[PDB]
Point group: D3
Chain length 92, copies 6
Amino acid sequence: DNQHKKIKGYRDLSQEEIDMMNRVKELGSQFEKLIQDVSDHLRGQYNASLHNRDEITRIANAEPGRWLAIGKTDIQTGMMAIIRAIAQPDSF
Amino acid sequence: DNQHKKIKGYRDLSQEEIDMMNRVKELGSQFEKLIQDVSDHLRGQYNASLHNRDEITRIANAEPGRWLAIGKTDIQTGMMAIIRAIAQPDSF
Amino acid sequence: DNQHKKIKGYRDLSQEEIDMMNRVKELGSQFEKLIQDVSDHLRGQYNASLHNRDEITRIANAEPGRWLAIGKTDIQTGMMAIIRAIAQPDSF
Amino acid sequence: DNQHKKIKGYRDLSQEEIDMMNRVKELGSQFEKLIQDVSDHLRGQYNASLHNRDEITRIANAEPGRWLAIGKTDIQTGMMAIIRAIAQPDSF
Amino acid sequence: DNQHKKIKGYRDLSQEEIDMMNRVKELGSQFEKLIQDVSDHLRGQYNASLHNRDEITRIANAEPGRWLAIGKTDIQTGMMAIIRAIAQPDSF
Amino acid sequence: DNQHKKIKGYRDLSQEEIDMMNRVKELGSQFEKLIQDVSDHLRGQYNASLHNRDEITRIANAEPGRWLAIGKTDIQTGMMAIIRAIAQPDSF
């Protein structure tokens, strides 16, 4: 029982606080399925212009899977900070 | 007409690409209304524990409006990078 | 009981995992006292060169309390990501 | 002699300033040994659940070495900004 | 015609605004050629100390191509935010 | 003499390395004058639409001085990481 009460910074939460943290996570699921859709598209448009070197140089220069990775990380860290704003740990 | 074709890095987009960029922005609207809801909550719980100095020190130490600001920025920059992954500008 | 088991992404943790998360937080306390020491120093060197406009322009241009704020945020988000690496939530 | 006086933004430092910058770096050594310990743990728990596909999918989905990498970078950039707050270069 | 007027957040821009966004991108080209020069240098100093294990351990510990990658990303996201400050989309 | 040789992580630099670090800082001066120009523009377009509440709500919603601040920080941290890639400190 109660493993998070062993971690420093635990605060008792309301249901209202817990509902807001699950609403953050629910919306992050919708971003997850969106990034998966963008990843499928990038993988489709890379394979559908095989042997066309000008478009493969165009995709290599645009670096879109890297930017999709930067986008996923910032969505996730943003969710973590909104959750921190709601949970409010008494710890640095 | 066509002001973005004056900006360096313009690429012609498909409707499929434009639909994906508007789907990013639509989901960011849902995060916008969520952060507004969290902001209303923090402003409610600050005012509802006026003159209780221990809880005002507890809110001051937790810094939740600052973390909500860090959360909003990272959601926005994450949306900007996913949109960059789809639009793919031919520019640094 | 068990409020974090109501939040999506909960995973059962070992004591070894809990000890590592508290070791992250303990070290963040040492960074907290360090940033407090740097903040006291900046507030000391601002007041100890009152009316010297060249040094007040030198402090204003260097922007050190802003950089100390950027430093505190990155220490905190770094602690949050190491804790995420240990806790490993089954959620986006 | 004096190679950093060839770099734009050099400022003469006190011993008090130099002691604070070395205290930042000393504490970053303690974070370095912590991240090494977390890295050893993740490499241990990956190998100790070889051929269990459900736990390898659980580790792959949690992405913990990636989050440990995000955590290391933010600890380092946070140390760089606290050091900038102390050193205060006269340069953008 | 006018594909960016299909994307949510479009605002009509002045030539003064468009000149400022192209001035951001022009300066980012100068940073691009700089990072390419730094990348060539790192690749030169890695190959020019092959079989010297102490210097290869020194380069591996310093992690400079990783820091050059962190530097390129932050230059790019900084350009994106200055452009956002000028373009000012009416969207989250 | 030699205050940076008292700081942990000092490495002897070449002139080629010092020239590259000053070339980073020179280009950051050009970004500094650019952000100053963007700041003057935002302050001009705020004052030139005083008492027009729809445009003041449009500027308040777009948050451009905040995005200019996010842009300045990321340009600066990007310069710091490129300089770290060149200087290569033997320290965490």
